[PDB]
Design a binder for this molecule. Structure first.
Ligand SMILES: O=P(O)(O)O[C@@H]1[C@H](O)[C@H](O)[C@@H](OP(=O)(O)O)[C@H](OP(=O)(O)O)[C@H]1O
Lengths: 213, 726, 75, 296
């Protein structure tokens, strides 16, 4: 069972997401920071919550699947969606904060996209597919209009090119899982491949790998 | 005054129930104690290096804790947890490097790492303090855990949370998890006299932090007070040594036959440099102008100069360094950076401040009585010679830590030997001895402890320093005592297999494993251990792993085999085989006969005399020919003095049918032929004559031709024919 | 005769005890040959069997001067 | 101490609670036993949770065994050394009229009973773990002593039955050693003492319970196990089997035997009979006839 304090986060996360809907830059900036004597950044707290739930470095080291379970998978997806809403618009400051945060949440997002949650996937593939889709959406939003390659460099540091090429190939070959699934694995693979092209524009190895036979 | 920073070396002085410095009882023990009688703030304890701690930042043990939990209670999961723990360790190291030099503030988390033992102080909320039941337990842990976290809090109302900690301020150390402040209780340990336990319990005790050394001064490129150094005389290429000659400690220059004088390293040559400071508890990096003292690590005496009996003044060791005589001054032998700090591994010239005389090496030996004197007298003279200069060589902290561990282990094993000699040893003491023996096994083997069985450890390359420490620090002697005392009432060799004696069995196998590991590729240790060959043989035949040590000691060692083997060893072997009538002992004799596939004339002749002597013929099976053309017959006499005679073909038939007695007799006979053949190797005519008299060419041909006999028996007969006759 | 028996049978190295006995037999043959007991014609009639043995289908090591060395007038 | 009784009563015959008892509760109880002191209430709470509604909880047994052995000399106190045995005898000599409530002797008995109960599930982990703590030598030494009360004897017999005899794996000491035979001789002596006491119009309820509950079950388990039919060492000792047979059949012959506990007694006879025919031991004519009267 989930504690009351962790439970209350879900309505708070949904409310914050609703505030920043319609790509409202004003409310996104206000949530990130305010013209107040004491400033409290909400996007960093959301990233920290995602990191702690996913295990932070422990999760990013390949143990992400163990921490994620069906009971809190919904909360994980909710926080990922909230981060995506913060990033989209696009918001330069929110994306920079999320990518370059001390908690290293971007590592958790990359592990989520790359490392499948073995326990959840074994009995519920659909939740893992949706979670991967949300993580890919967040990463795409992070580099929606980031001409600078520093964010792409950070992502590549947290994520090797070969693993994206392999993951794209598997997602294309994972279409059989679409049966009784709302989200097509091939669609998620295509989004990941678009993100891979965006990274390849900065990375030569990913560009070479993405080229077909 | 100054603000305490991360990475500083400080000493804590409690002034609550008992006034004293917190310290440890040793490196093999995990108890922290306070000794009020040891010293005070004005007069620090003589062994001050045991009271020094380093302040370190907060560290993460979550992944390490998960790995430990997994180990306590699949393979891929364990590997992933190990990788996570390693990554956490690396991250902690990087963070500690980052936050190095930061100012400590009240309410923050600080970890105290003991310098001598390199173990973090820890408070366990799941265990009670030994002497005081209500209070929780405090112990030193090398790896560290969450219990090591401590909050530094203001003992004075003037100090407030968030303020910078100032050196010399009384503070309160509160364990984060336990939440009960440390306390210097009044309970006194039974084993140690004058030492009081430190336990976690609500109290009013306060710890006065004293800055022994600043973080900036803690650099390895400079000569720092408290460092252990070696004094090497460049002109004579000798290391200064202090040791007891007849009944008094004397200082001299040891003479070494090694190719490299610097390569000659001994415990007695270790000295500790202490920089004189206004504050008794303050060390810090030294300067050329500053005064210095040198303290003998092993004995604790201080170097000084005294009236020469006849070279006006002579160097000697005095019990106390507080006297002004022990003071010394250093003079550079080369250009220096505007009288900056003394560099590490720098040549210096020593002068006596009180007398204003410079040191000098004299050829007058101190041990002229000895056939080969090795001790050369040193003296201080008013005139200075540029040639006479002593270089200071820094020693790694790891070597000092290993030496201290060796000394403490030797002391504990000596105590255990005394207990065993008394005849009674407690179960907890036995468990502690077992644990220390396992630690010694892993320490000598120089292999990381990753849960592998201690008994079966393989080392790619021996560590010569560890083996030299084992020999010099008397650890091998304590191990020999551990092996000898229990068997001679407390425990019997025949009773070893009993479940009641299982822990003693494990202790003895651990001791023999230690002996085997210590003597790999070492002539001096090989001789020292082989001096107990009789004791090793006495324990042969029981599950004590003595066979492995015996084989390793004499394996591929012609000189050791020749020196340590006499008629007495073969007498013991033949007596044992007569008692047991076991072929394996004849196999041992055969192995003794030949080393490295080459016959050893001396031991070969000794075994020739012993085995072929008219006495002991009962164990030796007899072979004859019966017309019954002629059939080979074997006659054997059992230890009961009963004589049995059976044809070789009949014996083979009985062995084929499964008769245990005949099969055992045939195996003993085969080992007899093996021993005879090894006795006749490399043209040993003395035994060849006797064996030819016993067995002829025709007899061996008949035995080897007959196919009904066992194939291995025919092979042994063919081997004997090849050696003895062909 | 023993070398002939070993060569006659297929897969001679199958029964460990027989491998030990064959080792002893070949050691005896080697020692006798280096003592010169075997004649040159006998040596050929023997090396036929030895080659057949190695043809495709209590242990002490002693090594003398390298036998696979070109004989030389002065050693 | 007052909260321990309430905690025990909360979990008392409640399987759904005992089987779901969380680790922190057991850890807290063990720490109280270690740090706070050695009290019987904690042992009773630990014992009541292992067995609920008859069924044995394998989990609670496993955690209790794992945590109890971690703490030694403060929680699991045992008297195996000669000095410890002498101290135990000195303390017991004052309990001839009955074990005093809350005394250390009762704590030791409760600890032994809890350890035996933790192994009453044919387990392979707890049994080996507790075999080392209390060797058979100490058990036989404390049980064969002349000055021994019935409580400790019953506790030790229950331990050696559940922890040593009734096990899933072979134990070398039990069968390939002359230890259990002295226990059987002591059992025969106890049966003779029961007969003599009853003949004197007197009886000890504790002694009667000990002789009618644990000893018979221990003998049955020893003589009706897969590792006993081999009789690798049982062949050497045959007289003790006949002594046990005659003692048990004589006890059965007595009319005061209440029906409830007669069955097991009879069962023992059968088991011994099954051994006798297998072992080809000599039987007395009268005893053989009496046994054969009911064999068929
Ligand atoms: O070359 P080997 O045969 O190994 O002998 C070593 C060395 O040649 C000296 O005998 C001795 O040095 P000292 O005379 O200075 O003692 C050294 O002892 P050590 O192991 O104590 O250095 C030996 O180990």
């Amino acid at each position: 069972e989930m504690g009351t304090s962790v439970l209350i986060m879900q309505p708070i996360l949904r409310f914050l997401q609703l505030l920043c809907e319609n790509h409202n830059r004003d409310l996104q900036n206000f949530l990130r920071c305010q013209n107040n004597k004491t400033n409290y950044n909400l996007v960093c707290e959301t990233l920290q919550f995602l990191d702690i739930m996913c295990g932070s470095t422990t999760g990013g080291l390949g143990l992400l699947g163990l921490y994620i379970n069906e009971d809190n998978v919904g909360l994980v997806i909710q926080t990922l969606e909230t981060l995506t809403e913060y990033c989209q618009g696009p918001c330069h400051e929110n994306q920079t904060c999320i990518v370059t945060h001390e908690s290293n949440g971007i590592d958790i997002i990359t592990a989520l996209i790359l490392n499948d949650i073995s326990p959840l996937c074994k009995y519920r593939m659909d939740l893992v597919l949706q979670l991967k889709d949300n993580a890919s959406k967040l990463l795409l939003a992070l580099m929606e209009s980031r001409h600078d390659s520093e964010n792409a460099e950070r992502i590549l540091i947290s994520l090797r090119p070969q693993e994206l090429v392999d993951v794209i190939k598997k997602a294309y070959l994972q279409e059989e899982e679409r049966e009784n699934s709302e989200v097509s694995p091939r669609e998620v693979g295509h989004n990941i491949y678009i993100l891979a092209l965006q990274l390849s524009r900065h990375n030569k190895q990913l560009q070479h790998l993405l080229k077909p036979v | 005054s100054s603000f305490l920073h991360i990475g500083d070396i400080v000493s804590l002085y409690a002034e609550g129930s008992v006034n004293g410095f917190i310290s440890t009882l040793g490196l093999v023990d995990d108890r922290c104690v306070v000794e009020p009688a040891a010293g005070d703030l004005d007069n620090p304890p003589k062994k001050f290096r045991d009271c020094l701690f380093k302040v370190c930042p907060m560290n993460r043990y979550s992944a390490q804790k998960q790995y430990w939990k997994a180990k306590q209670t699949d393979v891929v999961l364990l590997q992933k947890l190990q990788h996570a723990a390693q990554m956490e360790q690396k991250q902690n190291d990087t963070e500690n490097k980052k936050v190095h030099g930061d100012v400590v503030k009240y309410g923050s988390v600080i970890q105290l790492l003991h310098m001598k033992s390199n173990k973090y102080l820890t408070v366990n909320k799941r265990l009670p303090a030994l002497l005081e039941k209500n209070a929780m337990r405090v112990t030193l842990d090398a790896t560290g855990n969450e219990g090591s976290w401590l909050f530094i809090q203001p003992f004075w109302k003037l100090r407030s949370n968030g303020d910078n900690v100032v050196v010399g301020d009384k503070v309160i150390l509160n364990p984060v998890n336990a939440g009960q402040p440390l306390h210097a209780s009044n309970y006194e340990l039974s084993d140690n006299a004058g030492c009081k336990e430190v336990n976690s319990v609500n109290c009013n005790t306060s710890w006065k932090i004293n800055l022994f050394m600043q973080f900036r001064d803690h650099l390895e490129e400079v000569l720092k007070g408290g460092d252990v150094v070696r004094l090497f005389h460049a002109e004579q290429e000798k290391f200064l040594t202090c040791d007891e000659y007849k009944g008094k400690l004397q200082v001299f220059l040891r003479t070494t036959l090694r190719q490299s004088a610097t390569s000659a390293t001994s415990s007695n040559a270790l000295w500790e440099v202490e920089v004189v400071h206004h504050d008794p508890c303050r060390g810090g990096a030294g300067h050329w102008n500053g005064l210095y003292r040198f303290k003998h690590l092993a004995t604790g005496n201080y170097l000084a100069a005294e009236e020469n009996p006849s070279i006006k003044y002579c160097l000697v060791a005095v019990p106390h360094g507080n006297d002004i005589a022990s003071l010394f001054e250093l003079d550079p032998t080369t250009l220096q950076k505007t009288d900056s700090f003394v560099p590490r591994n720098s040549y210096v010239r020593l002068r006596h401040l009180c007398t204003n005389t410079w040191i000098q090496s004299t050829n007058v030996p101190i041990d002229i009585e000895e056939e080969r004197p090795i001790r050369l007298m040193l003296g201080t003279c008013p005139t200075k010679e540029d040639k006479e200069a002593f270089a200071i060589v820094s020693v790694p902290v790891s070597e000092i830590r290993d030496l201290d561990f060796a000394n403490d282990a030797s002391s504990m094993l000596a105590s255990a030997v005394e207990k065993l000699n008394e005849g009674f040893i407690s179960q907890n003491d036995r468990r502690f001895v077992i644990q220390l023996l396992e630690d010694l096994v892993f320490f000598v083997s120089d292999v990381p402890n990753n849960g592998q069985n201690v008994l079966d450890i393989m080392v790619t390359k021996p560590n010569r320093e560890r083996q030299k420490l084992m020999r010099e620090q008397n650890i091998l002697k304590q191990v020999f005592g551990i092996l000898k005392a229990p068997f001679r009432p407390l425990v019997r060799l025949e009773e070893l297999s009993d479940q009641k004696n299982a822990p003693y069995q494990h202790m003895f196998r651990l001791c023999y494993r230690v002996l085997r590991h210590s003597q790999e590729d070492y002539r001096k240790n090989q001789e020292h251990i082989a001096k107990q060959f009789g004791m090793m043989q006495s324990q042969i035949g029981y599950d004590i792993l003595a066979e492995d040590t015996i084989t390793a000691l004499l394996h591929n060692n012609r000189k050791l085999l020749e020196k340590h083997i006499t008629k007495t060893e073969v007498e013991t072997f033949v007596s044992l085989v007569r008692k047991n009538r076991e072929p394996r002992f004849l196999d041992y004799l055969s192995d003794l006969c030949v080393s490295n596939h080459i016959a050893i004339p001396v031991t070969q002749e000794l075994i020739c005399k012993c085995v072929l002597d008219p006495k002991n013929s009962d164990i030796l099976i007899r072979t004859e020919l019966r017309p019954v053309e002629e059939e080979v017959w074997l006659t054997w006499t059992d230890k009961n003095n009963e004589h049995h005679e059976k044809s070789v073909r009949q014996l083979a038939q009985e062995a084929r049918a499964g008769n245990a007695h005949d099969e055992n007799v045939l195996s003993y006979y085969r080992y007899q032929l093996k021993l005879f053949a090894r006795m006749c190797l490399d043209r040993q005519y003395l035994a060849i004559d006797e064996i030819s008299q016993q067995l002829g060419v025709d007899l061996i041909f008949l035995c080897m031709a007959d196919e009904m006999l066992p194939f291995d028996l025919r092979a042994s007969f063919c081997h004997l024919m090849l050696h003895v006759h062909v | 005769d023993y070398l002939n028996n070993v060569v006659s049978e297929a897969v001679p190295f199958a029964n460990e005890e027989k491998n030990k006995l064959t080792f002893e037999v070949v050691s005896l043959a080697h020692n006798l040959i280096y003592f010169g007991f075997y004649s040159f014609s006998e040596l050929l009639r023997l090396t036929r069997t030895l080659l057949g043995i190695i043809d495709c289908v209590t242990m002490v090591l002693s090594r003398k001067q390298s036998v696979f060395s070109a004989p030389s007038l002065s050693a | 101490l007052l909260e321990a009784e309430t905690m025990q009563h909360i979990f008392l015959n409640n399987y759904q609670l005992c089987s779901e008892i969380s680790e922190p509760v057991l850890q807290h109880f063990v720490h109280l036993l270690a740090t706070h002191g050695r009290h019987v209430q904690y042992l009773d709470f630990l014992h009541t949770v292992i067995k609920a509604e008859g069924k044995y909880v394998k989990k609670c047994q496993d955690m209790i065994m794992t945590e109890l052995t971690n703490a030694g000399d403060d929680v699991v106190v045992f008297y195996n050394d000669k000095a410890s045995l002498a101290h135990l005898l000195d303390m017991m000599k004052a309990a001839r009229d009955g074990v005093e409530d809350h005394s250390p002797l009762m704590y030791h008995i409760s600890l032994v009973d809890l350890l035996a109960a933790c192994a009453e599930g044919k387990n392979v982990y707890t049994e080996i773990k507790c075999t080392s703590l209390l060797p058979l030598e100490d058990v036989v030494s404390v049980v064969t002593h002349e000055d021994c009360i019935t409580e400790v004897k019953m506790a030790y017999v229950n331990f050696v039955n559940h922890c040593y005899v009734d096990t899933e794996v072979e134990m070398k000491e039990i069968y390939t050693s002359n230890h259990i035979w002295t226990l059987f001789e002591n059992f025969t002596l106890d049966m003779a003492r029961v007969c003599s006491k009853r003949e004197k119009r007197v009886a000890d309820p504790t002694l009667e319970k000990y002789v009618l509950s644990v000893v018979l079950d221990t003998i049955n388990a020893f003589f009706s196990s897969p590792f006993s039919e081999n009789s690798t060492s049982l062949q050497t000792h045959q007289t003790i089997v006949v002594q046990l047979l005659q003692s048990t059949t004589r006890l059965l012959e007595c009319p005061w035997l209440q029906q409830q506990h007669k069955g097991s007694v009879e069962a023992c006879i059968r088991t011994l009979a099954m051994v006798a025919k297998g072992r080809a031991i000599l039987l007395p004519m009268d005893l053989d006839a009496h046994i054969s009267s009911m064999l068929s």
